[PDB]
Design a protein around this ligand. Structure first.
Ligand code: RET
Ligand code: OLA
Ligand code: OLA
Ligand code: OLA
Ligand code: LFA
Ligand code: LFA
Length: 218
């Protein structure tokens, strides 16, 4: 398990860089007025690239710092919401949602960090899990409500974005509780890494697809 976890960190590091530069190179494929979300998606992957380089070295040392993962999350999750919410809102509606979801994400990630750095299975560990879970469900329920009236290609493209988040983000609570289901400390790290690649590279790809649709592309 330890070597598999190291190899996955090293592969995910290159994967995040690849996501970054692919998204940048792909921005010419959409109209200028729809490139912003592609650039923000690339920024998300680029921040992750920086942190994954650190995480792989941290894991390789044998004294692993999950604070590298959580600081990556606290910066990148609110950014990922920026372009999700831009599809459905602008102006005052957008500002309020971006702020409120960002605050919620910060509470979720902070509660997770509090719990994960507690003794596994302790009351503190479960407190962090339960607070994070409730905030997570609140976020997902807000997300499900966004874009309900959309029709056509833009509705399909936005539902693909929504469903990637609704399904793909389940991996994180599974990873968090993997160490109490078995001798699986490393499996937590495996699951977080797989989740980040799927969710960050995947969301960038779907935001690019959303921008092609908005560009009038088939
Ligand atoms: C780019 C990274 C992303 C999208 C990270 C998302 C992480 C979360 C959805 C984590 C949520 C957690 C819970 C729902 C409960 C256990 C604690 C967390 C923080 C792992
Ligand atoms: C805690 C410190 C975090 C440091 C993160 C550094 C990440 C930098 C990686 C490359 C980002 C490049 C993404 C392109 C930015 C948007 C594109 C554009 O503006 O034209
Ligand atoms: C129990 C509810 C907690 C609410 C948290 C409120 C704000 C906390 C913000 C998120 C912190 C996540 C980043 C922590 C990692 C850095 C620590 C380190 O590097 O040593
Ligand atoms: C473990 C791995 C689980 C992976 C789960 C990923 C879920 C993806 C959901 C929807 C993605 C929509 C893509 C639309 C493409 C057309
Ligand atoms: C460390 C504390 C981090 C608190 C949240 C920071 C969010 C940064 C990204 C904001 C993007 C626009 C909403
Ligand atoms: C391990 C394979 C998981 C694949 C998930 C892909 C999600 C994004 C699809 C974009 C097209």
């Amino acid at each position: 398990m330890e070597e598999l976890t190291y190899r996955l960190f090293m592969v995910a590091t290159v994967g995040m860089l690849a996501g970054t530069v692919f998204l940048l190179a792909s921005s010419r494929e959409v109209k200028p007025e729809h490139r912003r979300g592609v650039y923000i998606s690339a920024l998300v992957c680029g921040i992750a690239w920086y942190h994954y380089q650190k995480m792989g070295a941290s894991w390789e040392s044998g004294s692993y710092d999950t604070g590298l993962r959580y600081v990556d999350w606290v910066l990148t999750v609110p950014l990922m919401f920026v372009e999700v919410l831009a599809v459905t809102r602008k102006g005052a509606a957008y500002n309020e949602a971006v702020r409120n979801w960002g605050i919620a994400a910060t509470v979720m990630i902070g509660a997770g960090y509090y719990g994960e750095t507690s003794a596994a299975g302790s009351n503190e560990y479960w407190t962090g899990f339960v607070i994070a879970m409730a905030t997570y469900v609140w976020l997902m329920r807000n997300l499900q409500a966004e874009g309900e009236g959309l029709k056509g290609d833009q509705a399909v493209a936005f539902e693909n974005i929504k469903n990637l988040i609704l399904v793909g983000w389940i991996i994180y609570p599974l990873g968090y509780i993997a160490p109490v289901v078995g001798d699986f400390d490393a499996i937590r790290e495996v699951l977080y890494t797989i989740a980040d690649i799927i969710n960050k590279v995947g969301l960038g790809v779907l935001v690019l697809q959303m921008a092609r649709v908005q560009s009038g592309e088939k």
